[PDB]
Amino acid sequence: APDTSVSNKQNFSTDVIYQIFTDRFSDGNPANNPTGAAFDGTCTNLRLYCGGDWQGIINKINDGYLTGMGVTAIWISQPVENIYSIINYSGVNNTAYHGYWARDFKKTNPAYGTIADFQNLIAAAHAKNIKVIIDFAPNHTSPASSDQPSFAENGRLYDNGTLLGGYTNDTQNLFHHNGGTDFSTTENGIYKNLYDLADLNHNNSTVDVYLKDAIKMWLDLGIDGIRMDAVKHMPFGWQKSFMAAVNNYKPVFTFGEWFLGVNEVSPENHKFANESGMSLLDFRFAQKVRQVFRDNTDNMYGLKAMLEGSAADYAQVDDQVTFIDNHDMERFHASNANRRKLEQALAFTLTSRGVPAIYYGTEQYMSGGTDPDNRARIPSFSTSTTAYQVIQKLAPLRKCNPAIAYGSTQERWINNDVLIYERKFGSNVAVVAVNRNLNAPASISGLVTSLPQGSYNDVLGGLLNGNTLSVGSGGAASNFTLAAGGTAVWQYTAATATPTIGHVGPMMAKPGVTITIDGRGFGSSKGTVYFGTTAVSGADITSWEDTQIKVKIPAVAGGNYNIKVANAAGTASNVYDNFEVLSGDQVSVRFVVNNATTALGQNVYLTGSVSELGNWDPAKAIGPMYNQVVYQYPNWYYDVSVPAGKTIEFKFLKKQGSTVTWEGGSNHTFTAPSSGTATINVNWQP
Numbered sequence: 001a002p003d004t005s006v007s008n009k010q011n012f013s014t015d016v017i018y019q020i021f022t023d024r025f026s027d028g029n030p031a032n033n034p035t036g037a038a039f040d041g042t043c044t045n046l047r048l049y050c051g052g053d054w055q056g057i058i059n060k061i062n063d064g065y066l067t068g069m070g071v072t073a074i075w076i077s078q079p080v081e082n083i084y085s086i087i088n089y090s091g092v093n094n095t096a097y098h099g100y101w102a103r104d105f106k107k108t109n110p111a112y113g114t115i116a117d118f119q120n121l122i123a124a125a126h127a128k129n130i131k132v133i134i135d136f137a138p139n140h141t142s143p144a145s146s147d148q149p150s151f152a153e154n155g156r157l158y159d160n161g162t163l164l165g166g167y168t169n170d171t172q173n174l175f176h177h178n179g180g181t182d183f184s185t186t187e188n189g190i191y192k193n194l195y196d197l198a199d200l201n202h203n204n205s206t207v208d209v210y211l212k213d214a215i216k217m218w219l220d221l222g223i224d225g226i227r228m229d230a231v232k233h234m235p236f237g238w239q240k241s242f243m244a245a246v247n248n249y250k251p252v253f254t255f256g257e258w259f260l261g262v263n264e265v266s267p268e269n270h271k272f273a274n275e276s277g278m279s280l281l282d283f284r285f286a287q288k289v290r291q292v293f294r295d296n297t298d299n300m301y302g303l304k305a306m307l308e309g310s311a312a313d314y315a316q317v318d319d320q321v322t323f324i325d326n327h328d329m330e331r332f333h334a335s336n337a338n339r340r341k342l343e344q345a346l347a348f349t350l351t352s353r354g355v356p357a358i359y360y361g362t363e364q365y366m367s368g369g370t371d372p373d374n375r376a377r378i379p380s381f382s383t384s385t386t387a388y389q390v391i392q393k394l395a396p397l398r399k400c401n402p403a404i405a406y407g408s409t410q411e412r413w414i415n416n417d418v419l420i421y422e423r424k425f426g427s428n429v430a431v432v433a434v435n436r437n438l439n440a441p442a443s444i445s446g447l448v449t450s451l452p453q454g455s456y457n458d459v460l461g462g463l464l465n466g467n468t469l470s471v472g473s474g475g476a477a478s479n480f481t482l483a484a485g486g487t488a489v490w491q492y493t494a495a496t497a498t499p500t501i502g503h504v505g506p507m508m509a510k511p512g513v514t515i516t517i518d519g520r521g522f523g524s525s526k527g528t529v530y531f532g533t534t535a536v537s538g539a540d541i542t543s544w545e546d547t548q549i550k551v552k553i554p555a556v557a558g559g560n561y562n563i564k565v566a567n568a569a570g571t572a573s574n575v576y577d578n579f580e581v582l583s584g585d586q587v588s589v590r591f592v593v594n595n596a597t598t599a600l601g602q603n604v605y606l607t608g609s610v611s612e613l614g615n616w617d618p619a620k621a622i623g624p625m626y627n628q629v630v631y632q633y634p635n636w637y638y639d640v641s642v643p644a645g646k647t648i649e650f651k652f653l654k655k656q657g658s659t660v661t662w663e664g665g666s667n668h669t670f671t672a673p674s675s676g677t678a679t680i681n682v683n684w685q686p
């Protein structure tokens with residue numbers, strides 16, 4: 001299939017995701033609605049169930065509401081079984097309508113549907129070229145009080161009906177009993193409870209094995225992607241081992257939630273996106289878009305900075321999922337604001353790099369503050385809104401114009417209020433002009449583009465007061481006036497002659513797994529694929545076509561490789577970097593080093609004999625290790641993903657800047673378990 005087919009579960013760059021709060025979308029089957037005090041059919045009480053389900057979604061997929069918009073993927077609430085208790089939070093009754101209070105990860109939430117309904121959802125979707133993404137929240141179960149076991153369901157965890165354990169009298173230690181996080185540090189927010197949510201302990205083999213088993217059930221049910229909830233709140237090493245479980249079984253596009261505040265830029269966030277095997281929800285993008293188009297607390301130079309910065313910070317910026325709002329923020333549209341603000345932000349998001357996600361109801365101009373006012377029932381299924389039409393004109397471009405799906409971004413004209421940028425990939429170009437000033441038009445002179453000489457009609461057809469562009473020689477555009485609140489899109493597409501890799505996925509796996517390389521100019525006859533210097537051709541290349549190649553990862557030593565392809569004629573493509581070849585299946589092991597005293601600003605790291613440990617390269621050591629919660633300084637600890645069953649030699653180091661100090665003595669050694677987890681406790685050797 002081509003890179004753009006619904007069958008492509010490794011790439012979402014050419015798709016537009018529509019985020020649905022199942023309960024608040026459409027009740028297609030009233031028979032499964034909750035009753036009593038846990039239900040409100042009028043959906044006036046937004047913390048109770050309103051009845052939306054999978055049938056409803058199927059109904060909107062079939063009646064053309066979603067397809068009419070140009071939406072090609074839907075991201076739904078966590079489908080697993082949630083607790084049934086109504087929880088009174090100081091007078092207010094609260095239900096698990098949101099789906100984040102899991103009780104059993106191997107069963108469905110009956111309010112949404114049966115496994116049968118779920119299989120039907122996947123089939124209907126797939127039938128209409130819509131990919132299905134599920135929310136998955138393995139950080140915790142539900143709200144529990146260890147001393148008030150009668151509270152809620154005491155955060156009880158079941159394994160397909162079988163009670164695994166509860167928060168109270170947790171002798172197995174499936175959970176964390178470290179108190180609640182104050183979000184003070186990253187380590188603090190990981191090993192302590194999120195509010196009152198029973199924090200699962202991924203270092204317990206039972207929990208480890210159970211979650212990796214549950215995800216496979218869902219993978220086996222045909223999902224096309226996974227949105228991981230609260231990634232900033234689970235150990236990174238564990239998550240990497242979790243992503244290795246998915247990729248080494250049935251790879252699917254995974255992206256996690258790592259909340260970033262306004263003007264917040266986290267290096268931990270960058271490292272996570274670049275090394276965990278999964279990408280992230282682009283909070284940097286979202287916060288900046290709101291400041292610029294919504295709250296006017298920054299201008300075009302700020303948007304530009306974010307664009308060029310992110311592109312440098314994220315190794316695969318095209319895999320970051322963009323949005324302008326979600327269920328954890330006020331809705332972008334404020335009741336009294338000019339709608340043109342939402343429209344422009346939509347046009348910008350849809351044509352920008354990454355994977356755009358649209359929160360259900362946006363196209364209907366829904367307003368609302370924080371939870372739960374931002375989760376009201378969709379008031380209508382009208383296709384007559386300007387927002388609906390903007391999405392409808394622009395969504396398809398991600399499929400037909402690879403410049404938009406994979407292209408680089410470049411500012412071509414800019415001022416406080418105006419931003420003109422160009423996306424380019426191969427022989428494809430797209431230029432977008434946005435004028436946020438709702439009162440002042442702008443005189444655009446000196447605009448230079450990569451567009452071939454000719455005239456260009458605004459792809460939006462003047463919907464947002466865009467205009468025609470006239471490009472003379474040198475791609476220099478003639479002067480024109482950009483209307484107040486003006487937005488226009490111009491483009492040029494043509495066949496690409498040389499092999500151009502636009503995307504690879506999964507980004508991390510062990511040898512033998514098949515990866516998908518998407519792009520243009522591959523030709524129709526099998527060429528060669530290179531992993532570093534190793535050439536692969538013939539049978540291991542399972543499929544080859546102009547826009548897509550499927551190939552098995554050769555049995556090469558674990559490590560980081562550049563990927564390049566050369567067509568049948570021997571013409572080489574661009575280089576795609578940062579592909580990680582695992583040493584084998586992975587397991588999460590906790591490393592602990594005692595009495596490793598440091599000086600302030602000096603941290604302890606770990607390195608070892610395998611690529612998962614950096615191969616003795618301090619520049620690639622794992623850390624810095626933690627020393628607050630689970631163990632306290634001068635004892636350090638860290639959860640790391642290592643190849644299962646391998647005997648590994650390791651050592652710790654103290655690093656300050658790029659200045660490193662090695663542990664004395666001989667390498668410590670240990671053999672990783674074949675499954676489940678383990679804890680290695682050693683003393684720092686001077």
Ligand SMILES: OC[C@H]1O[C@H](O[C@H]2[C@H](O)[C@@H](O)[C@@H](O[C@H]3[C@H](O)[C@@H](O)[C@@H](O[C@H]4[C@H](O)[C@@H](O)[C@@H](O)O[C@@H]4CO)O[C@@H]3CO)O[C@@H]2CO)[C@H](O)[C@@H](O)[C@@H]1O
Pocket residue numbers: 098100137143183194195196197229230231232233257259260261327328371
């Ligand atoms: O009582 C249970 C509640 O749980 C549910 O909240 C969810 C969110 O909907 C998820 O999308 C996600 O979001 C968390 C996020 O993981 C977490 O970081 C936190 O964000 C902090 C952030 O760390 C901090 O840096 C600072 O910026 O403040 C942020 C808060 O704005 O909060 C997000 C939202 O809670 O995970 C949580 C838990 O899975 C549910 O939505 C609630 O209705 C429910 O009451």
Ligand SMILES: OC[C@H]1O[C@H](O[C@H]2[C@H](O)[C@@H](O)[C@@H](O)O[C@@H]2CO)[C@H](O)[C@@H](O)[C@@H]1O
Pocket residue numbers: 411412413414415445446447448
């Ligand atoms: O002509 C090439 C030149 O175009 C753009 O410069 C704009 C500038 O952004 C506007 O603010 C205003 O000053 O008009 C200029 C056009 O002459 C690009 O920003 C710039 O990089 C580029 O060299």
Ligand SMILES: OC[C@H]1O[C@H](O[C@H]2[C@H](O)[C@@H](O)[C@@H](O)O[C@@H]2CO)[C@H](O)[C@@H](O)[C@@H]1O
Pocket residue numbers: 597598599600601602603627628633
């Ligand atoms: O909590 C992380 C913290 O650990 C190290 O700080 C040590 C410091 O080295 C010791 O001399 C002593 O004062 O205790 C601290 C632990 O609380 C790192 O030096 C520091 O950068 C790091 O943030």
Ligand SMILES: OC[C@H]1O[C@H](O[C@H]2[C@H](O)[C@@H](O)[C@@H](O)O[C@@H]2CO)[C@H](O)[C@@H](O)[C@@H]1O
Pocket residue numbers: 616651662663664665667
């Ligand atoms: O460079 C590979 C090499 O790294 C480690 O050796 C350290 C050694 O442990 C230190 O005490 C110090 O001498 O620096 C060496 C790095 O040059 C590993 O211990 C070793 O097995 C490995 O080959």
Ligand SMILES: [Ca+2]
Pocket residue numbers: 027028029030031032033051052053111
């Ligand atoms: Ca229902």
Ligand SMILES: [Ca+2]
Pocket residue numbers: 139189190191192199200233234235
């Ligand atoms: Ca946690």
